């Protein structure tokens, strides 16, 4: 329907569970690979007989659990996480940091996957016109790899338009990344996904444990006084994310407009010339250092 294979991905700004202003992962960037229901040359696309459904529930005790649950829907090829402060710039990451810093509450996350098709690539690929046209503008050397450097991660985050950074080539590299991301999708399951972030008081969870009913089972069956945030992937935006009819309608608009809900990616330096590969790796390290949040 819509080509998402080979699209760029910003793993710093990515968020494979959603964003209130975007109907897809905010890290998804325009397609980088050029290609030829109908199978492309060098890859494969398989359709599903139904909306393949799957549910997963997990308690998110800290930002590591949140980032790990996110890593299941956006990892490197082979299940291994991307790392390097993944998703640390996404809005849904700071919101969860704020909600978990309270530390008097337990947060759970439920995921309903409604996957409709699967796409992937085999083992040396054509790239789009704009991608090669932007790579041609890239130097062979990343300046900020030199630790003595006017432009640093903290300097770039404070003022990127400062003369210290404008003298270096760093703003060039960042622009490229800001346009194309840090990775590209080599495999993807597209369709729809509904994720609930549940925020409950520890007193009520103690009450549930006293009653004997399982907290996770009660949360799955219910979707017992909680705060609910709803994140949506795929289909058309519902003007009120918290309505039963909004759910019922978006679930059917998913088929019309599916979007990647669980994908495996590959670093972009595999697509760059060998001379620029190490410089680009340094550049993406600098990018994760400057935009990501280590403290
Ligand atoms: C794109 O790649 C295919 C094989 O992946 C190749 O056959 C084709 O020639 C390439 N495109 C052009 C315009 O040559």
Check: CB of residue 105 under 8 Å from CB of residue 112: no
Residue 105 neighbours by CB distance under 10 Å: 17
Reduced DSSP (H G I as helix, E B as strand, rest coil) percent helix, strand, coil of the chain, to 5: 35, 30, 35
CA distances from 132 to 18, 29, 53, 195, 272 (A): 30, 15, 38, 37, 9
Resolution of the solved structure (Å): 3.1
CA angle, 233 as apex, 45 and 266 as ends, to 5°?
A: 50
Per-residue DSSP letter, 127: B
How many domains does the chain fold into? 1
Q: For residue 75, what are the contacts with CB-CB under 8 A and spacing of at least 6?
A: 81, 82, 264, 265
Closest CA to 246 of 235, 257, 255: 235
Ligand 1 in reach of 37 Cβ (< 6 A): no
Query: Facing residues of 195 across strands?
Result: 111, 231
Name the structure determination technique.
X-ray
Q: Tell me the CA–centroid distance for residue 39 and ligand 1, in Å.
A: 15
Contact at 8 Å (CB) between 120 and 187?
yes
Q: Is 41 in the pocket of ligand 1 (CB under 6 A)?
A: yes
Instruction: Decide if 86 contacts 74 (C-beta within 8 A).
Output: yes
Helix 91-101 / helix 63-71 crossing angle, nearest 10 deg:
150
Q: Report CA(187)–ligand 1 centroid distance (Å).
A: 20
**Mutate-to-test residue for ligand 1 from 34, 41, 123, highest number of ligand atoms within 8 A of CB:** 41
How many CA atoms, within 13 angstroms, populate the side-chain half-sphere of residue 88? 16
By most ligand atoms within 8 Å of CB, the mutation choice from 122, 126, 127 for ligand 1 is 126
Distance CA 133, CA 125 (A): 16
Residue 81 Cβ inside 6 Å of ligand 1? The answer reads no
Q: Give the CA count within 13 Å in the CB-facing half-sphere of 204.
A: 15
Question: Strands 183-201 and 74-76, how do they pair?
Answer: unpaired
Distance (Å) of CA 168 to CA 134, 142, 222, 269: 18, 9, 55, 21
What is the span of the domain harbouring residue 15? 1-295
Distance CA 115, CA 47 (A): 10
Smallest Cα–Cα separation from 178: which of 23, 24, 284? Answer: 284
First-to-last C-alpha distance (Å) of the chain? 41
Task: Count CB neighbours of 11 within 10 A.
Answer: 30
The angle, 0 to 180 degrees and rounded to 10, between the axes of the packed helices 215-222 and 202-211 is: 100
What is Dmax (Cα atoms) for the chain? 65
CA of 36 to the centre of ligand 1 (A): 8
Report the SS3 class of residue 5.
Answer: coil
Ligand 1 centroid to 41 CA: how many Å? 9
> Residue 227 gets which letter from DSSP?
E
Q: How far apart are CA 147 and CA 112, in angstroms?
A: 45
Cβ of 126 closer than 6 Å to ligand 1, yes or no, is: yes
Measured from the CA of 34, which atom of ligand 1 is nearest? 1
The Cα–Cα gap between 100 and 183 comes to: 29
């Amino acid at each position: 329907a819509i080509n998402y294979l080979g699209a760029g991905y910003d793993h710093v700004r990515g968020n494979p569970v959603g964003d209130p202003s975007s109907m897809g992962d905010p890290g998804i960037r325009p397609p980088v690979l050029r290609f030829t229901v109908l199978q492309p040359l060098g890859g494969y696309v398989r359709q599903y007989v139904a909306c393949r459904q799957s549910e997963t529930i997990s308690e998110l005790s800290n930002l590591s659990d949140y980032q790990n649950e996110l890593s299941v829907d956006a990892s490197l090829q082979g299940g291994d996480p991307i790392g390097l402060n993944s998703f640390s710039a996404s809005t849904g990451y700071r919101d969860f940091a704020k909600e978990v810093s309270k530390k008097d509450t337990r947060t759970y996350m439920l995921k309903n996957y409604c996957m409709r098709y699967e796409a992937g690539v085999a083992q040396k690929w054509n790239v789009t016109l704009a991608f090669a046209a932007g790579v041609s503008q890239l130097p062979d050397v990343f300046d900020a790899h030199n630790p003595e450097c006017a432009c640093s991660a903290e300097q770039w985050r404070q003022d990127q338009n400062a003369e210290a950074c404008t003298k270096t080539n760093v703003p060039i590299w960042i622009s490229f990344i800001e346009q194309f991301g840090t990775h590209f999708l080599v495999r993807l399951f597209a369709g729809g996904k509904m994720t609930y972030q549940v925020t409950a008081k520890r007193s009520e969870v103690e009450k549930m444990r006293n009653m004997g009913i399982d907290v996770k089972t009660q949360l799955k069956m219910q979707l017992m006084n909680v705060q609910k945030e709803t994140l949506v992937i795929g289909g058309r935006p519902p003007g009120q994310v918290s309505d039963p009819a909004a759910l019922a309608a978006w679930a059917d608009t998913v088929e019309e407009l599916p979007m990647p809900v669980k994908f495996e990616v590959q670093p972009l330096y595999h697509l760059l010339p060998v001379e620029k590969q190490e410089a680009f790796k340094q550049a993406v390290t600098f990018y994760s250092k400057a935009v990501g949040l280590t403290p």
